[PDB]
Amino acid sequence: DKICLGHHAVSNGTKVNTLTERGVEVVNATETVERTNIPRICSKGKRTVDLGQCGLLGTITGPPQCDQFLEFSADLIIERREGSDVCYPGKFVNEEALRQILRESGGIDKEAMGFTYSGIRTNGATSACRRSGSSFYAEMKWLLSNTDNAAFPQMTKSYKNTRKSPALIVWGIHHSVSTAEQTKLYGSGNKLVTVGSSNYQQSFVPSPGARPQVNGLSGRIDFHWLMLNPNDTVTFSFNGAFIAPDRASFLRGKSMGIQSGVQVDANCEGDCYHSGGTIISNLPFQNIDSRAVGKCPRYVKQRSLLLATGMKNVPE
Amino acid sequence: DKICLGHHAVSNGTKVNTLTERGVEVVNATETVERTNIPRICSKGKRTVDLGQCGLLGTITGPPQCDQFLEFSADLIIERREGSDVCYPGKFVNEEALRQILRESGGIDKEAMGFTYSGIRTNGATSACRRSGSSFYAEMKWLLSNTDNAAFPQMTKSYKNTRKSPALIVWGIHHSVSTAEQTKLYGSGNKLVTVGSSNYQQSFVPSPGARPQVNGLSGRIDFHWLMLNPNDTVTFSFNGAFIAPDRASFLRGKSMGIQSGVQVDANCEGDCYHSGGTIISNLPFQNIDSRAVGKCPRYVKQRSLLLATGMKNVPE
Amino acid sequence: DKICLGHHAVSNGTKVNTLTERGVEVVNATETVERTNIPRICSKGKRTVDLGQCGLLGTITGPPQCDQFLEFSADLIIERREGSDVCYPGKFVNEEALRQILRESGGIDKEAMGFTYSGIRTNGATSACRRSGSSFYAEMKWLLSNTDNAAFPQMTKSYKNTRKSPALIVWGIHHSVSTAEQTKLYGSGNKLVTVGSSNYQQSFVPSPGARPQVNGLSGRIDFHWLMLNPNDTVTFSFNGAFIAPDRASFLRGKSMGIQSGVQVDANCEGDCYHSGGTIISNLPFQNIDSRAVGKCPRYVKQRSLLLATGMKNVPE
Amino acid sequence: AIAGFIENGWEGLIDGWYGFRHQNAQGEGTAADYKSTQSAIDQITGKLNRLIEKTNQQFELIDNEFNEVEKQIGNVINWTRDSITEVWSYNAELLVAMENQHTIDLADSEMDKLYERVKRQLRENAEEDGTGCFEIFHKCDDDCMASIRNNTYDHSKYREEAMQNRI
Amino acid sequence: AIAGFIENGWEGLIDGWYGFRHQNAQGEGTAADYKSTQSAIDQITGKLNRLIEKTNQQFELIDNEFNEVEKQIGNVINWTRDSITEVWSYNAELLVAMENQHTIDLADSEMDKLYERVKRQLRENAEEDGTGCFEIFHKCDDDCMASIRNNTYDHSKYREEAMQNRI
Amino acid sequence: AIAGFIENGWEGLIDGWYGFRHQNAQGEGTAADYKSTQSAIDQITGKLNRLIEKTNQQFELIDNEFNEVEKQIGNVINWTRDSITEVWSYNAELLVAMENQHTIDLADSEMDKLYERVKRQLRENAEEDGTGCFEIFHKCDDDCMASIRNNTYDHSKYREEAMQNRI
Numbered sequence A, B, C: 001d002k003i004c005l006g007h008h009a010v011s012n013g014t015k016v017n018t019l020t021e022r023g024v025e026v027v028n029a030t031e032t033v034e035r036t037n038i039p040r041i042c043s044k045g046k047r048t049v050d051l052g053q054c055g056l057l058g059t060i061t062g063p064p065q066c067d068q069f070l071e072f073s074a075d076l077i078i079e080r081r082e083g084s085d086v087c088y089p090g091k092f093v094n095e096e097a098l099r100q101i102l103r104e105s106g107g108i109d110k111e112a113m114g115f116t117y118s119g120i121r122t123n124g125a126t127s128a129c130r131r132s133g134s135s136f137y138a139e140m141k142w143l144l145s146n147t148d149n150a151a152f153p154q155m156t157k158s159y160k161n162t163r164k165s166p167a168l169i170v171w172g173i174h175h176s177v178s179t180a181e182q183t184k185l186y187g188s189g190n191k192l193v194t195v196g197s198s199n200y201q202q203s204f205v206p207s208p209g210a211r212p213q214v215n216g217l218s219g220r221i222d223f224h225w226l227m228l229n230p231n232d233t234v235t236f237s238f239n240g241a242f243i244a245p246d247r248a249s250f251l252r253g254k255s256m257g258i259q260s261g262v263q264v265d266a267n268c269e270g271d272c273y274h275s276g277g278t279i280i281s282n283l284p285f286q287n288i289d290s291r292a293v294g295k296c297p298r299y300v301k302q303r304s305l306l307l308a309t310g311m312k313n314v315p316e
Numbered sequence D, E, F: 001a002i003a004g005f006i007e008n009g010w011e012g013l014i015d016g017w018y019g020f021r022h023q024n025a026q027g028e029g030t031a032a033d034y035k036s037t038q039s040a041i042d043q044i045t046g047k048l049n050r051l052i053e054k055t056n057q058q059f060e061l062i063d064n065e066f067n068e069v070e071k072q073i074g075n076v077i078n079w080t081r082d083s084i085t086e087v088w089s090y091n092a093e094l095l096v097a098m099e100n101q102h103t104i105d106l107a108d109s110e111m112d113k114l115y116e117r118v119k120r121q122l123r124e125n126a127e128e129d130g131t132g133c134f135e136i137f138h139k140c141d142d143d144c145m146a147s148i149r150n151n152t153y154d155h156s157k158y159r160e161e162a163m164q165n166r167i
């Protein structure tokens, strides 16, 4: 009589790798590298803003595409390829740092800066910024000499941050197509804009000249920004070519920002995003997108690594 | 009769983690992640300079807080939060790079640059830089027109680095509160400062205008620097708004620089520092401060990871 | 009678480290950290360009040392310490990014930009750029006023990239020795160069002034660049001090670039390079140079780590 | 006809990982061992709990897919990202190769423990045949076989008969 | 009343990691085995020597706690730092789980080596009881027990008596 | 004079990693075991295939050995490079220590397997001497020794004679 000890085996074994062998068969195994993508932005449980044609930096200056987002609030901010920060052509200086500040901001709450003016026009407008006809950035004012060619008075305007959070302050410098145009708008002579806080000082001289027409226009407005500390003051001194802020921005809280080309889906939950969707997974690794962001499995180069969940498979 | 083989066990076992189990009890274990901080800067064996109210960049220009450190020598440099680089308001351009050059410098040896002047005043002074009354940066000269509103002669000054090491050269540009003040100091008309070596040329135009009062003053002096190679010459050309160097700086050797809020202790030795003290440990990991510097255990997120130093504990 | 089971041993054992012991002897072992260098650049199977006295950035502008490489083609590009980008003194701005773009380029194909001029001279030349006497950068034109001191007309020139690849556009700014010389060349008054595409705008002001002689000359020409997208236009607006491009560059394909002080050897093949030669190895680690590039073993600090390829060595 | 783990595994053992297969006058039968089976599964579950973890660390964009960052900083970021990727790809490959080796050795070790236990229960009443079975030198009916499986076989009861049969 | 390592460990064994516990006419006693104990301690000490290392690499500040660096470079620095932290946290957790698994297996393996050695000294004179003990089939007084412990027990001397008693 | 693996290895075994050494009336002799030898070599070769890998990832220069980059970016690059170097140096030391421990334990475990196989072939006809040898309790000439080596020894043929000699 006899008794034998044994272990199970299957005919359908699965190959894995060990320290000493490639492709040893085990009874069972499981994937460690995530390849399955959901082609949507799984936004359940999160206040989500889909910026559409509004570029993220445009929420601060307010071209017409951004009119609905001037004071937006969100946990999750989505930028889109069609998004433009601008109506009158130009760009933000140090733009990516500011995008990175705004992506995590929770959104922005705007506050009037209280500037008023005398001896000048305030109504500069352009057909590039269309609302009910020619208009401009909602949050800014294109300051002009009182009449064509007239002299633009030397001016100083100051704003203090009364709040307990740093204020985001933005202004513009207008680079006319020619010295002729710059004279028409602001009066002849050398133009200078200075901007100072207790921790920041910089000077700006417009530089007129021709550049390629963008939206039929060859001028440019470049935007500059700073963070103004609680209790600190910012002072602007200028005699023209200045695009003045009407309001400051305060950051609301916390958010995450992504860039994406797929639709939002408020019915699925997720925390790991890339431009093509959402990686929903508990696996420790992923091979979908090395730039994925949020709380993500780690990106690896290999498409598959099988972890044995059973013994060596030894069939007869 | 009989004989048994056995192993020890204890009633006070310690839990550790393995590849297959959380919280298996072992006879003995030891910590691998350092948590114990010494709330002092253990400076034994090192020439240590505690900068106090002197900001590190101030050692080069010489506001009154820095008078004792104009030629300092050290192995370990400590910056403090109360440290200011400045007396008359302003700041250094490209400042952090320069701090990083000075933290590892071993200190600085100053050399007279040999400039002398005629047709101008050399005695600009301010109540912001207090010594025996109004004064100025020890290493610089505030050059003025000979009398109020008089014309400032066009000038050129050159210095050659005779040594075998690069010279740190610093100068300033003065931005007056108004074009009225700039005229009082340096005479009316356009001001220009040009600075050239064999590898560097740049132009500076002062930009007068109102800035918020810092120390009761609305002007700013901003500081610029360059590294002048052995045998090369730096040439300054200017007709006002120029804060001239009196001396160049040469780096002495090697040091480490930290930022801290706790006291120095010359009786304890150590090599790993952070703002809250010294991490004295041979453990391979630490959970105290991810920005610790010197020769340090590696920063991990976990507070504790126990390494078994005995066998499985199997009591009866 | 008896039978024994045993295993081999040798008298020449090799010491290795394990988790529990330093220097346990094994029957056989192999090195895991590469220390053997080949003091040549092993270029077999690769179109290799050894730039010699030509600096990589010179291939774009064309000083005389680079005349043979104006439209070079390669898989492997080697820069040398004697390489200079320049003939007239100066340098490229943002130089290292451009080097990085060129090292991987496959080389460059040049295309005429089609600019023509009236009302000015186009023949600026210098003894620093020697061909058959005084000459200039092959790919650029030193634009001057029609006659000494005459006014330099305000000018605009535009180029559109018709190709399917980004165009590398380069231009220069001339910083004269003095405002007198700047007047002789370009007429008196403020000089300004503006450069704009749909994604770029920047302004340049020359800064004349005295500085040390380099090659007997105190003037400088500094070079700037941008990447012009397919179908986009660049526009230059300027009234002097402008060194104009004659041609644009398009990148050919793919390459790798290195910096080296040893000879090329077209008879040995290799893919990991550093300045002192070629690391030919299948080991996973190397201790030769932490800045080696190509497809390399990973740099480690240890000189040696022996992997056991045999059992414990237990001699009698 | 019947053989143990040294030859191969049993495709017919579907109730467990480890088991007993016997042959006596009443025929052949197979039964899973619940304890060794569970001990192996628990160690695999323990591995999975450790390896199926999520990082809690949040990362943000430092790069821009629509509007390319400045080339110098972009190249530093890409170099850093590719170096980090090399590290994680290496760690992942190693983790799995090292864990699969351990999983396989651990499963075999649980088989040896069961076998060694049964050997010690049987004492002088059986011999090893070299395939993972014991030739039992007394009559061992279905109750007896069950007593070996559930660890209550008393060798003393059969020793006299068995030792005599072994000579 | 007396049992070995298969049941549990001995709280009363305070002179060593491994030992012998005997029972004969003169009573019960326990003694540590110095060699196996020292072999295990030396392997743990070997681990500690390797793991209680210091880096010799010096790192410097690239950041500023009093006056914040520019935001773009600051976010690159912090992304890089947090990636490096993830790497080290993961290596630390793995290092300890792997080393503790090995420490535990190594200690059990030293116990098995000692047991196997005694089994082979005893040859045909003893049988395993299944708790980690040997039933010795001859009178084995204190001097005989000591000869087992110090590896001089000569099985031939007792074999005639023992083999007869085993039947 | 003759002994097995428990005492030490054999310098004279040059045809293999493991082997058999015998003593009978016709003298002493030693032969390699091809199967166990090859099983070990194949496991080492499997390691080497995994560890002698090339990265396929291409890296480029981000730094400049002839003309130093700007200091702030240089310091970030150097910090990042040194941190990466710390990670690789640590991984390389651990990889080799861990693999060497496994290589050693695996080679011993192949020895034990062979020994255990021979034990089981011999059944009741031999006893362990404690040095890694079997005292065989019947005459075993060169052809018998060969049948042990090639796994065709039939213990039934000699059992009667051997069991009697063991008493």
Ligand SMILES: *[C@@H]1O[C@H](CO[C@@H]2O[C@@H](C)[C@@H](O)[C@@H](O)[C@@H]2O)[C@@H](O[C@@H]2O[C@H](CO)[C@@H](O[C@@H]3O[C@H](CO)[C@@H](O)[C@H](O)[C@@H]3O)[C@H](O)[C@H]2NC(C)=O)[C@H](O)[C@H]1NC(C)=O
Pocket (backbone or CB within 6 Å): C010, C012, C014, C027, C028, C029
């Ligand atoms: C421990 O020992 C052996 C034997 O060492 C050898 O024996 C004597 C000749 C000595 O004086 C030694 O110098 C000599 O190495 C090692 O194996 C041996 O390796 C050598 C060197 O790699 C082999 O030489 C080969 O020779 C041919 C043609 O001459 C070449 O084409 C090959 O490239 C190769 O180098 C040699 O054949 C081999 N010896 C035998 C008998 O097989 C062993 O590796 C060593 N320990 C370690 C860690 O390497």
Ligand SMILES: *[C@@H]1O[C@H](CO)[C@@H](O[C@@H]2O[C@H](CO)[C@@H](O[C@@H]3O[C@H](CO)[C@@H](O)[C@H](O)[C@@H]3O)[C@H](O)[C@H]2NC(C)=O)[C@H](O)[C@H]1NC(C)=O
Pocket (backbone or CB within 6 Å): A028, A029, A030, A031, A309, D048
């Ligand atoms: C072969 O391999 C795997 C082992 O990885 C087996 O599937 C796994 O089974 C476990 C538990 O039995 C699953 O856990 C579950 O996880 C969810 C997730 O939130 C939890 O809520 C549940 O309560 C549950 O515990 C695990 O997910 C699953 N793994 C995978 C990748 O699907 C499989 O059944 C094995 N086959 C056999 C025949 O044993």
Ligand SMILES: *[C@@H]1O[C@H](CO)[C@@H](O[C@@H]2O[C@H](CO)[C@@H](O[C@@H]3O[C@H](CO)[C@@H](O)[C@H](O)[C@@H]3O)[C@H](O)[C@H]2NC(C)=O)[C@H](O)[C@H]1NC(C)=O
Pocket (backbone or CB within 6 Å): C028, C029, C030, C309
């Ligand atoms: C001691 O260990 C060393 C190092 O592992 C042994 O040398 C190695 O032998 C292997 C297998 O034979 C070599 O592989 C060969 O190389 C290439 C690529 O695979 C191929 O051309 C060959 O056909 C073969 O596969 C390996 O190169 C070689 N390594 C080194 C560094 O020499 C050596 O044989 C060992 N000595 C003894 C006595 O066992």
Ligand SMILES: *[C@@H]1O[C@H](CO)[C@@H](O[C@@H]2O[C@H](CO)[C@@H](O)[C@H](O)[C@H]2NC(C)=O)[C@H](O)[C@H]1NC(C)=O
Pocket (backbone or CB within 6 Å): B028, B029, B030, B309, E048
């Ligand atoms: C339990 O383990 C610890 C930690 O390894 C032992 O303490 C160490 O002993 C070594 C040398 O034996 C000393 O060099 C270290 O100073 C000790 N390390 C620490 C962190 O304290 C300790 O003795 C052990 N306890 C017992 C009873 O064995």
Ligand SMILES: *[C@@H]1O[C@H](CO)[C@@H](O)[C@H](O)[C@H]1NC(C)=O
Pocket (backbone or CB within 6 Å): D071, D074, D075, D078
């Ligand atoms: C950085 O990597 C991305 C791939 O993620 C690539 O598209 C981009 O062009 C790289 N940047 C440079 C400057 O090569």
Ligand SMILES: *[C@@H]1O[C@H](CO)[C@@H](O)[C@H](O)[C@H]1NC(C)=O
Pocket (backbone or CB within 6 Å): E071, E074, E075, E078
């Ligand atoms: C970088 O990290 C620290 C915490 O280490 C944080 O205080 C600082 O704000 C971070 N920088 C940015 C721009 O988020």
Ligand SMILES: *[C@@H]1O[C@H](CO)[C@@H](O)[C@H](O)[C@H]1NC(C)=O
Pocket (backbone or CB within 6 Å): F071, F074, F075, F078
């Ligand atoms: C960066 O490292 C290199 C060595 O690789 C050194 O020569 C250089 O000075 C270091 N850079 C700085 C800015 O300290």
Ligand SMILES: [Ca+2]
Pocket (backbone or CB within 6 Å): A071, A109, A110, A111
């Ligand atoms: Ca509001």
Ligand SMILES: [Ca+2]
Pocket (backbone or CB within 6 Å): B071, B109, B110, B111
């Ligand atoms: Ca001095």
Ligand SMILES: [Ca+2]
Pocket (backbone or CB within 6 Å): C071, C109, C110, C111
């Ligand atoms: Ca061409």
